[PDB]
Structure formats: structure tokens, C-alpha cells
Symmetry: C3
Subunit: 383 residues, 3 copies
């Protein structure tokens, strides 16, 4: 078709915002959660894997994720963006912008994993893992949800990536935490308060960039982008309050980490639902995501028993799941949502959401497992 310059502008900026989430958003976020001794290594890994993803994305990621093919992957007709005229239009923007925007999603997804595990994984091993997981889990899942694949064919609702990004990364990260052990130094059993301002800063950058992430997922600066934008503001706020309220009632006082985690919880929770729900639904999903996230990390604490950056996956995983399920409810017009597809009832949509979640969890988990093992067998995983 013909590109709308307003959409081109909106989408390029949204892409920059999503890139901002990884560089430096997620890096600063984790920077404040890990011991100073491993910060440089983590930042190096996040930066290098970010570069790797950017390259793999243009080389074949975009083609296999967005190209037309089957239910699990696209094709290789767009390797290095070959056959894509610069003036080619995807939706209402130049396809090149579509490439960049989708690539930025691959980046933050990988950043979520690497930022948490970098400190316990060999550099060469993380590179191998990223290649394997990006290629076999991210790309296929991205194709399944946004590339007209299996999940999209089943009518799975996921506006900005509750599955593709959050659940996908959460499971990969948790498998990594499961396979790769980490010696907790004496006196380092809890996140160091002094470094928390960096967590706040990273959270802030993730939040601001998330507007490009959520609203940009509309692919145009229209009313849906506006809705997604407002719902992002609302769900985040509601989750911050939900988490802080729960924390206050559970610990007697709010904490900075709680407030930040609440923000992430709402952002993750609203990710799949933002363009399909009403503001009231966003507020409810936010509150529930905030409380669910608190519950999740509390549960992880029982397993780990110590503060660990991988606790982040508890939020992305639990809140991603909660958000995806909740989207199946709040997408209803009776609830101020956009509506379900033709012939779809809330009950059916919920089942589809659950199916999408289950497939994503198993798919990412299996691929992550293979990735870590391949890395271990080849160069060795653990630092």
C-alpha cells in the first residue's frame, strides 16, 4: 500500500523507545540487582548479545519471524532484507520500520534473559545460548503470534507480547537459573540498597520505552495506540499500588524495589491486553498483576531463599501469564474491551489464551534447555 508518514514517524520513535528499553533500560535495571563485581560483565554481555540479536534479526530473524511460511516459522526469502524494496509498505509504514520495530522486541526479550543470567554464565556460552534460543524459540513464537502462525491462527490475543516477550523470556531465564548455579557471597543474600537507585532508573527507562513497546504495537498512531498508551499508564500505576499495598500489608511497609517491581508487573500484565481492553480493565489487570507479581517473587524466595536478579523472571512469568489470561476476559465489550473475534466467546478465548501460554512455556523451556546444554557441552555454561 502507501506509507503514512505520521505512522512512519510514530513507529520509528516507538522503535527507538523499545531499543531504549534494552540499551540502557534493562542493563541499568539488572545493574542495580547484581553485585558490583559482576556489573561490568553483565553490561558487556547485554551489549554484545544486543548487537548479536540486531544482526541475527536482519540476517534471518525478520524473514523467519514475519515472512509467510507455516504455523511455526516464516521463510528465508527476506534474508538480509533481500527482496524488500525500501518503499515496500507493511501495514501503514515502510516495511523497513516494521523490521526495526520487531527487531527491538527481540532485543529486549533477550536482554531480559541475559541481564539476569550474565553474571553466572560464560561469555562464549551466552552467545551460543542467544543464537539457539533466539533462532528456535523467539523467532518461532514471534511467528506464531505476530507472523500469522499457530497462535494467531487460533485467535490468541496478545497485543504487545505477553507470550512472545515476557513468558518466553521468563521461562528461558528460569530454566537458566535452574541449570546454572550461583554461589551467593556472604552478606550478599539481599539486594544491596545502595544500588537500588539504579534499579529505579532502569525501571523508569523500561517504563518510558514501554510506551513505544505497547502503543507502537498498534502499528499506527491511531485510537488503538492511544488506548494502549493510556492503558499502559493506568495498568502500571495500578500495579505499583497493588504491589505496594500487598507489600505494606505483608511487610508493614512499602519498599522501592516493591514499587519498581509493581511497575514492571503492571507493564508486563498489560502488555498482551493494552490494545484490547478498556481503562477500567487496565486498572483491574494492573492491580491483579501487581499482587500476582508480589505473590510470584514471594514464592521464588521460598525456592531460592535469597534475592537474585532471576527473581525478575517471576514477575515477567507470573504477570505475563496473568496478563494473557486476563486479556481473554477484559477484551469483552461488556467490560469495555474491543471484542472477541467472530464466533468467539469469553470461555473459548480464555482456553485459547491458556493454550498460547502453555505452548510458549513448553516451547521456550525446551529450546532454552537445548540452548544451555549445547553451550555447556561446547564451551561450558557456568562461570
Amino acid at each position: 500500500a502507501v506509507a503514512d508518514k505520521a505512522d512512519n514517524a510514530f513507529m520509528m520513535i516507538c522503535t527507538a523507545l523499545v531499543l531504549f528499553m534494552t540499551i540502557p533500560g534493562i542493563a541499568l535495571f539488572y545493574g542495580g540487582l547484581i553485585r558490583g563485581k559482576n556489573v561490568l560483565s553483565m553490561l558487556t554481555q547485554v551489549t554484545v548479545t544486543f548487537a548479536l540479536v540486531c544482526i541475527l534479526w536482519v540476517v534471518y530473524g525478520y524473514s523467519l519471524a514475519s515472512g509467510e511460511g507455516n504455523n511455526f516459522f516464516g521463510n528465508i526469502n527476506w534474508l538480509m532484507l533481500k527482496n524488500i524494496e525500501l518503499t515496500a509498505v507493511m501495514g501503514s509504514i515502510y516495511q523497513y520500520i516494521h523490521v526495526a520495530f520487531q527487531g527491538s522486541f527481540a532485543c529486549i526479550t533477550v536482554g531480559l534473559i541475559v541481564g539476569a543470567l550474565a553474571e553466572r554464565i560464560r561469555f562464549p556460552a551466552v552467545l551460543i545460548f542467544v543464537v539457539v534460543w533466539l533462532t528456535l524459540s523467539y523467532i518461532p513464537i514471534a511467528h506464531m503470534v505476530w507472523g500469522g502462525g499457530l497462535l494467531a491462527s487460533h485467535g490468541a490475543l496478545d497485543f504487545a507480547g505477553g507470550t512472545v516477550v515476557h513468558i518466553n523470556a521468563a521461562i528461558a531465564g528460569l530454566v537458566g537459573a535452574y541449570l546454572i548455579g550461583k554461589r551467593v557471597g556472604f552478606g550478599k543474600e539481599a539486594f544491596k540498597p545502595h544500588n537500588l537507585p539504579m534499579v529505579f532508573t532502569g525501571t523508569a527507562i523500561l517504563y518510558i520505552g514501554w510506551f513505544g513497546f505497547n502503543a507502537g504495537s498498534a502499528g499506527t498512531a491511531n485510537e488503538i495506540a492511544a488506548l494502549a498508551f493510556v492503558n499502559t499508564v493506568v495498568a502500571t500505576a495500578a500495579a505499583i499500588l497493588g504491589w505496594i499495598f500487598g507489600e505494606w500489608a505483608l511487610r508493614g511497609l512499602p519498599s522501592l524495589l516493591g514499587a519498581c517491581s509493581g511497575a514492571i508487573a503492571g507493564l508486563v500484565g498489560v502488555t498482551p491486553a493494552c490494545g484490547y481492553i478498556g481503562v477500567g480493565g487496565a486498572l483491574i489487570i494492573g492491580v491483579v498483576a501487581g499482587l500476582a507479581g508480589l505473590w510470584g517473587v514471594t514464592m521464588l524466595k521460598r525456592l531460592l531463599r535469597v534475592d537474585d536478579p532471576c527473581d525478575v523472571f517471576g514477575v515477567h512469568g507470573v504477570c505475563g501469564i496473568v496478563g494473557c489470561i486476563m486479556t481473554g476476559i477484559f477484551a469483552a465489550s461488556s467490560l469495555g474491551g474491543v471484542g472477541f473475534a467472530e464466533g468467539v466467546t469469553m470461555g473459548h478465548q480464555l482456553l485459547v489464551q491458556l493454550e498460547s501460554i502453555a505452548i510458549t512455556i513448553v516451547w521456550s523451556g525446551v529450546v532454552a534447555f537445548i540452548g544451555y546444554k549445547l553451550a555447556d557441552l561446547t564451551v561450558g555454561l557456568r562461570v
Copy 2:
């Protein structure tokens, strides 16, 4: 009417930029002005009150601030954005974007107050204060200036919030500093130089986000937005130089805090004038605001005698006043400005500006007083 996607795009990005001012802009700004021992508490308060404002805004703030009603407040027909079709257009953008943009202003305004006072106010108390002050001071004043209220009816010129944001927050903050005492630890009588890079960083983020704040106030990516943008660059630069020049002549040397304060001084000063003045007027307002800000904080130092984050209110208050008054002068075409409204002379405009300033100061001061007292009587103000 019909939404212009270019404006939708511009305004959503501008909204993200304004949100960036609070999260993490103002938090980092104050983070570098308070003692490390209170940074976490301040960040938590800024984050939670930010969430609270976001929610209150959508619940009733937007309706009471922008809905049509009387001279002081709107209506409750838009509670939770009810009755607002997603495709509803306000100006040339979807109303939902208008909601978000205006909400971001409420956020930075509250952030300005909370960031400075958080360290000396009980958490539960700040929540009560925000509810009271946002509801009774911010919303009414916002309605008076941008909601077709009293001040707008009198022709008060305030492009981006010299009154609604800066003077409003400054008075609320100063009343808080007046009512809530703070024990200055030994050796903590001056801002710690080591933390100043954070003040710079916060200032930088506030500056960049301020473009969304000022230019976005045009409500469209037009020539007025362009003017506001250029004037923001110019006034800020002129104020940095004005402050640094004054500081140099007063102390014999420039300082980082002086440079940053100068930037804020110009940003605040040009806020009400940016879309109504010429670049020459912006340069003059900038220089004067920079010098006025320096004068203001110097005066506050005589009362406080110690460096305190609340010194920030001296800049927002004095520069807000200076900017609002100066707008009444430089809006003149003889001076390269846009012009005064029908039948308006510079003398009359100046009186209107003064009236707006006086009303804002008294209104915010009274409401803030009530807010702090209610908080004190209920849960206790002081930490």
C-alpha cells in the same frame, strides 16, 4: 472532528517525554540533592505518588480538570473516562491522548513536590496530601487555566503551565517546607558534591522531557509547537548562561548546581511563554529567569541557611512568577510575540498575569495547608 495521525503521534511521544520528566527525571534530580539515607524513601514516594496521580487522573482528575463545568472545576461525566468514545477527538488528536498528556502534567507537578519533601514526610501522609492537593488545587487550577475556567476566561496567558505546574507546585512545596521541619545532620549543611552528577542527569532528563511538555502544549506538530520547541532550547540556554554569569560574579566561579539550576530556571520561565513569544523574547526571559532564580535561591538560603532540596521551589516559584509576568510583555508582536487577545493591551495582560499568579499562589497555598494539616491530624506529617 477528525484526528490527525501526525498530531496523535507527536502528542503520544510528547506525553511519554513528559512522563519521563517524573519517571525518572525529577526522582534523579532530587536524588542528587538529598542525603543517601533518604534516597530510597524518596524514590519510593515519588513512584507511588506518581502511580496514585495516574489513577486519580483517569478516575476523576481528567473529568474535573477538562470537563466543562464552572470557573473552578469541570464535571464528573468522564469518570474513568466513561462516555469518551475511543475515536473521540479533542483538538486534532484522539481524546485519549489528551487525557494521557494532561495526566503527565499532573504527574510531574506532584513529582516536583514529593521529590523534595518525601524525605521529611511520612509515607501515609504524602499519599493523603497528594489526594487532597491534586484534587483541590491541581485539578481546579488546571481547569481554570486549561479547562476554560476562571483564568482562561480572563485571558491569562500560560502556554505550558507557569501557573498550573510550577507556581502551583512551588507554593505547595514551600508550605510543606514551612510546616514540616527537617533536622540537618552535622556535615550535611551543603549538597554533597559526589551526588551532583545525579542532579545533572535528572536536570538533563527534565530538559529533554520538557520539549514534550512545552512543544506538546501546542496540541499539534505545527508552527507553534516548533516555536515552543525553539524557545525552550533558547530560554534554557540563556538561563544557564544568566545563572552561571550571576553566580560567577557573585561567587567568583560557576558551579554544576548553578548550571543545572539555570537550566531549570529557563525551562520554568519559558513554560508559560514558549508558544506566545519570539526567540528574542525567549532569550531575554531566559536570562532574566536565570538571574531571578539565582536571586530566589540566594534569598531562600538566608531563610534556611542550609542547602535543601526544597530550594528547588525557589526556582520554580520565582521563575514561574517571572515567566508568567514576562509572558504578558513578550507576547506582544512589537516584541516578536503572537499577540494579545482581542481588545487586550500589554498593561491589561500584565494585570491578568499578576491576577493568575496571585490566585494560583493563594489557592495552592491554602489547599496545600489543608492537605498537610489533614495528613498531620490523621496519620502525622513529620518522619
Copy 3:
């Protein structure tokens, strides 16, 4: 003509992004490369010189850089933007936005110089230097390349400033490092690892802002902006990998500084080429720029023998040169590029690129020399 609001929106945001590169991008970048004892002074100098540039730009910079005149400078018909109607259109955006966008380039260029040298130059001296160098080197070179001057007339290809910004600043900075000595404290012979996260953060901000820098150089949110955007993502990623690969093979391990330097190397390298090359060309230029940058700083280390913020100029200078030369190759359609101008062959384009590089190096070097000497003779250069 008539302004396109989508382009207005895109360009104002891109301008904000470019400003973000200086405030606080480059400041944080250098903040992590200099000793804590000089950070405040550097930040003050970067902030004040930034303000100075902003003012000089509107006063006469824009007029002399973009006004029509001769091969080396424009005119003074636009002093303080006089004679520029607010509704005046330049390209497809309001001229005022053009003024702001170009001004932001002047700012980051000066920021690149000041951030590195501030710690060793007297404050009054840096002000004098900036006035001299901005006025006689930046403005003329900007006019020569983007103001229809000498280089543009010869068909020099430089999409976003390989010459105007990077080479120009690099030579000015290196001349400064040559003329101004710096005593290296004992134990401060290598960059302090503890401050490197700030370098990463600055690099990240520079990277994100660079999208406004490169894509905004298209002057419209079109397919060229999209191309530039994608090539920026790709070249940066390729350079990060190229540098890290070289570093790994040279030192046995990657480093955070290496990863960050690689990013800057790719960003600089692709700056002149981004809107003229294909993604494959961007990947190749990125890899080469990354390796060239590593080579460059390695060479500077042999001359300096110690880590120094001025090492940054090795990257901007070498990568700027490499990028400008490479643009003469990859602009070819056989290589996926846009094409050479009428009657131009690759060989001729390469010669033109070399001429542009040579002129920029000599021009900036001579002017910088004069600037530093004038400052030295008047107030004294060295701290």
C-alpha cells in the same frame, strides 16, 4: 512550500533525541572516563558550552551555516532568526524545526570536544575556544556540507555528519590534547572500572539519540529515514561485534569499554553513510568501523600510553574517516546503495570523500589551533 505535520513531529522528536545525546548523553559518557575529581567541572563545562552553542546558533550560527552565501559560509540575513516567518517551510517541515535540529548537531559536536577536554582546560578558556571553533570551523564546515557549500557542490556524500560532526570534532579534540597537557595521577593510568557503568549509560543515550541524529537527517519520516534507522541499528551492532571480536583476539577477552567503543565506532562510521547504503553495506561498514576504531585507540595508546578521555577522538576521527570513505563505496547500487550523483563513478566519489575528509581535518585543525591559542594568550588554556 507546505509543512507536513508528520515530518514536523518526526523532526521535533529527532531534535529532542539529538539534544539528549549531549544532555546528558555525552556528559555521562565522559563522566565515566574521567577521574571523579574532575567530573563536576566537566559537567559544568559541557552544560554551559551547550547553552553557549544553543545561543550562538540562533544568534548567527544558523544564518551563517544554512543561509545562502558562498562556498564557505552563508549570510547574516537570519540573525536571531529574523526574516523567518514562523510558518516558513524548509523541506517539508517548519524552518524553525530545521533551526532546532541543526542546532542540536552543533551541540553534540561541541559536547564531544568539551566533554573530553574540560578537565584540562580553564573554564573561561573553553568558552573562548567554543566561540572561535563553533564560529569558524563548525559553521563553515556545516555550510560546506549541508548548506550548499564547497563540499556539497563537489558531491561529497555525508548523510548525517561524518565530517561536520565526527571528523570535525575529533581533530579539534586531538589538537586540544596535543596543546593541553594533563598530569596523570599515580594509579589513574587506566580508566577506573567502577565508573564504567556511566560510560555504558552515556553510550546507550548516545545510541538512542543517534536515531534522531541519523534518521532525522532525512528531514522527513520517509523510506530514507527508515533506511537510516535500520542501518544505524545494524552498523552499531556490527561494530560492537567487530570491536569485541578484535579485542577478544587481541586481549583474550571482551570488555565493557570495548563493547561501548564498538557501538560508538559503528554509530560514527555509519553516520555519513546511513541514508545512502543498503543494510548489507551497513553491516560491513559497522564491522570495519569497529575494527578500525579498535586499531585507532590502540594506536593512540602507543602515543599517550595511558587511558584518556581524548581516546574518544581516536574513534570519532578514525571511524569518521572510515565511514566517509566507505560511503563512497557502499552508496553504489551494485552494493545495495542509493546511487551516485549524475556522471559520478565510484572512483570519483571516493576522491571526493577523501577531499572532504582532508578539508575538514585541515580546516578544523587550523581553527581549533587558533581557538586554543587565542584562549591561551587571553586567559590561559591549562588548568
